[PDB]
Amino acid sequence: GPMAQQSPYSAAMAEQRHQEWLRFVDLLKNAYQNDLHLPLLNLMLTPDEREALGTRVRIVEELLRGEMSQRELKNELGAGIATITRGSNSLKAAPVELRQWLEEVLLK
Amino acid sequence: GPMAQQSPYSAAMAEQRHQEWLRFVDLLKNAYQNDLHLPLLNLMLTPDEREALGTRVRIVEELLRGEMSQRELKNELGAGIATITRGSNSLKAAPVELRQWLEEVLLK
């Protein structure tokens, strides 16, 4: 039995809600071009919904600075041990004349 | 006593929510220009909030066609009696030779 994936009612109401969302995105796009975006957003949204969107922008900003500041901390800490291992390896491969000279001038 | 119109806390939180709304409107404006509006709207809104905006566009459309269709009905009905009164006035001001001729050809 090849069962139908969805009903004809759900398929029609899915395309309807799809076209209604596209009409809104297109309506808001031309509003930004016709400089009517600010009054249109007041018609589409309540004052509380506008405050919610303004705070969500600050939420995703503080979430990005939270991930980025620790991403730079994970890279700065990881690169910190990289210069130490490079310093240890380059010190072993250094010639004897340079090594014994560094022990004399750096360690008095 | 010249009472202060609002508190310093309410004035600061009013400018904050004002700048957060402007940042959102500007963020969405550049998204439409950088062709990133569709993924940004999915980040800012839930699927239910997107369905709500898509239906509100159809609401304001059906509210406009409701007002417009009856506006045209109020104008078509008002202009209908205007042609009747013009027909009555123009018929009284018509000459006798035209009036008695219309009674002969239109009323057999």
Numbering used by the authors:
A (entry chain AA), B (entry chain AA): 22 to 129
What's the paper's own text on this?
Tryptophan repressor (TrpR) was one of the earliest gene-regulatory proteins for which a high-resolution crystal structure was determined in complex with its DNA regulatory site. The TrpR dimer is formed from deeply intertwined monomers and is related to domain-swapped proteins, even though it does not meet a proposed definition predicated on the existence of a stably folded monomeric structure, which TrpR apparently does not have. Formation of the extended domain-swapped structure depends on the conversion of two interhelical turns in each subunit of native dimeric TrpR into helical segments, resulting in the formation of a continuous, nearly straight α-helix of 47 residues. TrpR crystals in the typical native dimeric form have previously been reported for a variant in which Val58 is replaced by isoleucine (Val58Ile), one of 19 TrpR mutants created by Arvidson et al. to explore the role of the identity of the residue at position 58, which forms part of the l-Trp-binding site.
In the course of this work, crystals were also obtained and a structure was solved for Val58Ile ds-TrpR with a 23-residue N-terminal extension including a His6 purification segment, a spacer segment and a protease-cleavage sequence. The uncleaved protein is expected to include the initiating fMet residue, as inferred from mass spectrometry of similar N-terminally extended proteins (unpublished observations). This Val58Ile TrpR protein with intact N-terminal extension is hereafter referred to as uncleaved. In the wild-type ds-TrpR structure previously deposited by Lawson et al. the first modeled residue is Ala2, although the protein contains fMet as the first N-terminal residue due to its incomplete removal in vivo from the overproduced protein. Connected but weak electron density that is unique to the uncleaved protein is detected in the solvent channels originating around Gly -2, consistent with the presence of the extension in the channel; this density is absent from the corresponding structure of cleaved ds-TrpR. The remainder of the uncleaved Val58Ile ds-TrpR protein structure is essentially identical to that of cleaved Val58Ile ds-TrpR, except for the additional two N-terminal residues. Indeed, the presence of the apparently disordered N-terminal extension does not reduce the resolution of the overall structure compared with the extension-free structure. The crystallizability of ds-TrpR with a flexible extension accessible in the solvent channels suggests the N-terminus as another locus for the attachment of groups that might orient guest proteins within the channels.
